[PDB]
Structure formats: C-alpha cells, structure tokens
Amino acid sequence: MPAIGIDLGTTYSCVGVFQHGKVEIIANDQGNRTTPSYVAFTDTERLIGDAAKNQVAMNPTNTIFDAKRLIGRKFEDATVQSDMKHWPFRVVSEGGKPKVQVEYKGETKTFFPEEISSMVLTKMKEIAEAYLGGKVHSAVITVPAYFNDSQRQATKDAGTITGLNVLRIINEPTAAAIAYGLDKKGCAGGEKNVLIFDLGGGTFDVSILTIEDGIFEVKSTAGDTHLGGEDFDNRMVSHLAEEFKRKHKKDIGPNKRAVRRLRTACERAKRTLSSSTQASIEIDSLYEGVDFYTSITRARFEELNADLFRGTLEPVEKALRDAKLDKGQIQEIVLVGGSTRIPKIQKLLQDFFNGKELNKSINPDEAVAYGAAVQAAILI
Ligand SMILES: Nc1ncnc2c1ncn2[C@@H]1O[C@H](COP(=O)(O)OP(=O)(O)O)[C@@H](O)[C@H]1O
Ligand SMILES: [Mg+2]
C-alpha cells in the first residue's frame, strides 16, 4: 500500500499517490481532481467537499470553510478577529481557542479548526482509499512556509484525528519544487534559486528557495493572505450585478442566494476565460423569476482585475529584495495554484522576468499534492 500526498488547502484540497514511477492525482466521487475544503451541517447530514460547496447558496450559516485561517491560532489573534467579520458562520472561544459553531442534527455543535480540517483530511483519505483499495496508512501533508509550530502541530492533530501516520509536514513551495525535481537537477553548486509564484483561491504566496545538495532553504517569502481567485470572482460579481440591475431594474444585493449563485456562475466563467476569450453566464430564475443570461469577455475580466493582477508583482519584488537577489538570479520560476492558469497573470510574470519561460507543465493546482506524493513515496 502506497503512502499519499495531501495538499490541505485554504479553499481546495488535493490528494496524489506515487505508484510505478509516477504520480497520479486522484479524482473524487464527482470526478474532480480537487475537492473544496468545505464542510456543511444540516438537521440530517454532514457534507464534505463538492457536495458542501455546491449547497452553500442554500446553507450559508452552517457551511464552514477557511478553517485553515483559524488552525493553530488563538481566538484573540488580530487575524482571527479580522477574518471573523467576513465569514457567514459563527466563531466562538473555548479555552482561548477559536471554534466554529453550527447547527447539526438538532443541536448547536462547536468544532475546533483541526476537527474541521480532519473532516476534510478524512474525505481525502476516503477518496484515496476508493482509488487504491484497502486502507491508507501514511501521508505527507503540506502547509504554508510561514506556518508556525502551533499551526503545524494543529495540522498534525487533524491528521491524527483522521487516523493517518503523518510522515512529514512539508512546506507548500518545497512540495512544488520537489514536484519539478529541482533537488535532483544539477550536481555542481550555484545557480539553484527557484521562485514559487503561488496564487490560489484565497491566498497569494511568493517563496524563494535555494536548493543545494538536496537541501531546500527558504530564502524569503512574501505575498498577501487575502488575495486569491475568490477576489477575482467578486470583481465579476459586482460588475454583473450592476448589469442585471441595469437590464432588469432589480437589485440582487440584499439577497444572499442570488449573490452566491452569481458568484458561482462568475467562478465558472472565469475558469472558461483561461482557455477561451469569451464565456457565457446562464442563471435560471436569478431573482423574482427573472433569468440572467449574459456573456463576458477575457478582456473585460482582465480590466475588472487589472490592479489585482498587476499588484502580484509587488510581492515578487519584495521577495527578491529580502533574498538579496535580482530577478536575473532566479533560475526557475514555478507556477502553483489554480489562479496561475489566468493568461494575463502568466504574461505579467513572464514579462517581469524578461521573457523567461515559466514552469507550468504540472497542473498548477495539483503541483503541491504532486510533490507531497513524491516525498511520501521517498519516506516510505
Ligand atoms: N482554469 C482556471 N482559471 C482561473 N482560475 C482557476 C482555474 N482553475 C482554478 N482556478 C481558481 O483557483 C482557485 C483555487 O486554487 P487552488 O490552488 O486549487 O486552491 P488553494 O488556493 O486552496 O490551494 C480558485 O479561485 C479557482 O477558481
Ligand atoms: Mg494552495
């Protein structure tokens, strides 16, 4: 039985396995190679993953996400208190630790962040067991490079609750570097600087690593923990909500379900705009029985996000400054995260790096799990 690599992500999680010399990223039971890091509770059910994310429109107060923003933190931490103001679910304090509060089968229940993340890990373990047959024993789990020991330990605790032997907790950018074999490339010293540009659903991370004799050293990190694909979706939502109001004289703003359904449609369209120059929006009965069918272009999407896309270069500059490197001293640039599929992002980054080709042959939203799966097989 092989060990698995799990990317336990802020917005999505991904599981891979290394068998017969190669990594397979494992599809879940809806056929998807990534699974939303979502857990929903009702009077009769606990849903995890696609099932949870797909019903958030109908169940916003008891659908938990963003547990990674709480894990290993204290309730009174400024980051926790700030994030709470933007979540539809309730967070409370128990012994100084944050817990999410939900209604579940006739009772108010509270869960530690590591309990929620354990539910997600159990789903990833179950996906892997459906794929492999039998029971999974061991896993490498990834975390952001900036995670402190409390955050790492709480992630380990989620693994323990799930019943996994956590072989190692490794950093996300290191996992990405491992996926590209950057620790097995070259023999002479020098010119071993890699920049990992990781733009996901909720966070943006730039990391510079130097890799000598198979030893990864994190030289610098930069980014924005509140910049990701969800923010690009929201720019579309504002734009298209204005359009619906203009065309149909109805303001969907006060209706949570309508806004959520438009947001889902926008995320779908956004993904399409990474490979096509136009995308359709088709929402039956968006508001008061009125359908919203429309079209959006890649160009318009880029305009709606022009500042956010261009702004990703600032953390790159900062990471370079902190590492005491010039952009010309980066030997490899690696794209990680689903949002790095956006053509304009790729173009801005490649232009910043003076035309240098980017590493993107591994699906960017799978690269962390891929490297975790490689490392798990190595650790046996
Ligand atoms: N083809 C695509 N084009 C643009 N954005 C995408 C595409 N595929 C996925 N995304 C976005 O990637 C984000 C999720 O990033 P991912 O790296 O998979 O998860 P996480 O950030 O949780 O690690 C979401 O905002 C999603 O909409
Ligand atoms: Mg990620």
Residue numbers in the entry: 5 to 384
Which of the paper's sentences describe this entry?
HSPA2/Hsp70-2 is a constitutively expressed protein with high levels in testis. HSPA2 is essential for maturation of male gametocytes and is linked to male infertility. While it is undetectable in many tissues HSPA2 is involved in cancer cell survival. Crystals diffracted to a resolution of between 1.8 and 2.2 Å except for the HSPA2 crystals which diffracted to 1.3 Å. In all ATPase domains except for that of HSPA5/BiP the products of ATP hydrolysis, including inorganic phosphate, were observed. We conclude that at least HSPA1A, HSPA1L, and HSPA2 bound ATP in the expression host, hydrolyzed their bound ATP, and subsequently during crystallization never released the products of ATP hydrolysis into solution. The overall structures of the four human Hsp70 ATPase domains that were determined here for the first time all closely resemble the structure of HSPA1A and related previously determined structures.
